[PDB]
Design a protein around this ligand. Sequence first.
Ligand SMILES: Nc1nc2cc3[nH]c(NCCN4CCOCC4)nc3cc2c(=O)[nH]1
Ligand SMILES: Nc1nc2cc3[nH]c(NCCN4CCOCC4)nc3cc2c(=O)[nH]1
Ligand SMILES: [Zn+2]
Ligand SMILES: [Zn+2]
Lengths: 367, 367
Amino acid sequence: RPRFSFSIAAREGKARTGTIEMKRGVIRTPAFMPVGTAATVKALKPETVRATGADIILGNTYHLMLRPGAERIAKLGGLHSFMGWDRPILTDSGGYQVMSLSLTKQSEEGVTFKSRHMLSPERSIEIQHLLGSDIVMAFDECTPYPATPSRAASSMERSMRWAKRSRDAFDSRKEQAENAALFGIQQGSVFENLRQQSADALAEIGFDGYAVGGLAVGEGQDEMFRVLDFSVPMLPDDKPHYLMGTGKPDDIVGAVERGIDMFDCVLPTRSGRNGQAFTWDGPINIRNARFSEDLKPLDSECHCAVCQKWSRAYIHHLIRAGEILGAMLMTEHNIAFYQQLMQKIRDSISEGRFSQFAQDFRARYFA
Amino acid sequence: RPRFSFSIAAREGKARTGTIEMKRGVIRTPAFMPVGTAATVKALKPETVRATGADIILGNTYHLMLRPGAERIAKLGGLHSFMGWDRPILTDSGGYQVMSLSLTKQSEEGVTFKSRHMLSPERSIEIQHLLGSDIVMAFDECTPYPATPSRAASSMERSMRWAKRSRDAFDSRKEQAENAALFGIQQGSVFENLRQQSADALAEIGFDGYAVGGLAVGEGQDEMFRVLDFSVPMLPDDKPHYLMGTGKPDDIVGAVERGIDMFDCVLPTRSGRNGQAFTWDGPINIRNARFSEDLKPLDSECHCAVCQKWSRAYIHHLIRAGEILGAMLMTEHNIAFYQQLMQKIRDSISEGRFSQFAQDFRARYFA
Ligand SMILES: Nc1nc2cc3[nH]c(NCCN4CCOCC4)nc3cc2c(=O)[nH]1
Ligand SMILES: Nc1nc2cc3[nH]c(NCCN4CCOCC4)nc3cc2c(=O)[nH]1
Ligand SMILES: [Zn+2]
Ligand SMILES: [Zn+2]
């Protein structure tokens, strides 16, 4: 397999389906990436993550540099070996904590977090090298929402300067440049002209893929969709488009309708541990007393191992009792559900009936 | 398979190895039973419990009657169906909480716990029927340690009266009597004459197996062994002997040397979640900083899936980070270790070299 090759097999309107080939494996798109922030997809063995259908998982520069340490992971043979996942890993650059943990001194050089730690385009790229990430994100600044046009512009301009520095850092590291891929991240808040400037800047630098950054930060679905409407067409058509931090199933569906190829969110894992289970008729809260004697599986159509074997009643008991198997079963099902969602999306695009699928999905999910 | 058949295949001194055949499966003895108090062996799927080598698991009348409820579990098709374990289940009778949660009003009729709940020989037997346990324990009173001879005698005499009531309750329930087995529980504290009276009383009533109760309650290994020395020979030789609540690996080994066939303890599961891992060179605490960069598996000889795939360093990180996969991996290994211990015990008895195995095990484990 090549370092990186993205091929589009089918389209319907702005939506597309295809594959990313990398050295550690093939990624089917549109893809959902389970989040493995602390070098584990919470409450799941990697074999189980794979069994649900995941092709790639997400790691995090910020968290892994704090614990257990980037250099330590490298000494131990890299993140893949460490956690026992041998397929592709995408790592975020720490740019989102630059905003969410704002503990912080910011400058053109980078960000200092307070023990004190530094992040910069160069250090972020180096850390992702130490981890051995397959898909490296540029170091950026996720602009807070809401932002004035002036502040959004200043922030986006700094991010584009940091994007160039990330590109150069990545390329100066021979082994990284030859074996991994680098994605740039578009910023510009909700403003069309700034999104355009950012897209132009990123394309001039040149990346393997392009993420839409700065969204899923409280703007709401209407506004996110409005921004995607003009923003995704700005990006190179022949490269993958990654919407960072999205999201709920309806968000994913609408985003694919608008040209997005890649997704990540903690929702299936986190909310799984909190008792929310996704079904084709919408989410349920398994803690609810109405499930105490319900012998049906979490979802009536789901093909996952959890739904093959255990009842709502049992999982209800486990979650109420705070039992670890509760978290395990809920999380496996929720991740399996998301992967079944992506599979149905890929198949419907391949067959030219994605518009109808979107319509059918929503009618039932929000009944 | 029969309702219950215990066959002894080999002996060495007081130790023996053989099988218990029941309708839901065969139990190899000496056996270790993982504890599944809240209708789950904590942090493990039943398939994983089986993969470690377990033939039978332990459930608890007291806990399951409180949550989720005995009648509810019965309406849902029984404990096996509920939790997804289709092999034998032994349930304790609630007799040990009669002492540990002493919240309690006690009388010849039974025990009232405070919502208020009642337990008695008749109610305990009924609850274990509702759960669908394969091996039912008689309702007893675990005498506190230390106890005066007079108080130990009074308590033991009440337990023997309760043993008769349990026998009669069990036999009056046709489906239970035809499909499950009933074990009596010896009491009498550390006093030889009272242990003898209890054994005589239990044998006169007649049970499928006999447990040594009232031990592993703070008496220490020397005293426990001293009591086992004269107590186990009092029990019917041709029936299984179950030492309740034991224990550490050295306790198990010495107990088998003294004629015990069956064991249960929370140690591998509970201490597993707390970071203690069992190895042939003794337990280690994986939280210790010395394991932060240790690439070796938890144990160098262990055949479990955990030791095949992940390092001490990774599990150290997970446990320090409070990650659920940490508990999962530690628990799987610890239960696998206990089952490997039992297997080595069975094989050494079969080959007439158990004495040597005991000696070799201790020399290395306590080096
Ligand atoms: N480097 C980089 N990473 C991003 C990551 C993002 N994540 C989100 N939204 C979701 C945030 N989650 C919500 C659930 O709790 C955890 C944080 N929005 C995100 C935006 C970015 C971004 O612009 N840059
Ligand atoms: N019905 C009945 N059940 C028993 C259960 C016993 N368990 C123990 N010792 C271990 C207690 N564990 C120690 C670890 O924390 C949980 C309780 N000792 C036990 C003794 C009995 C007994 O005499 N009767
Ligand atoms: Zn499912
Ligand atoms: Zn192991």
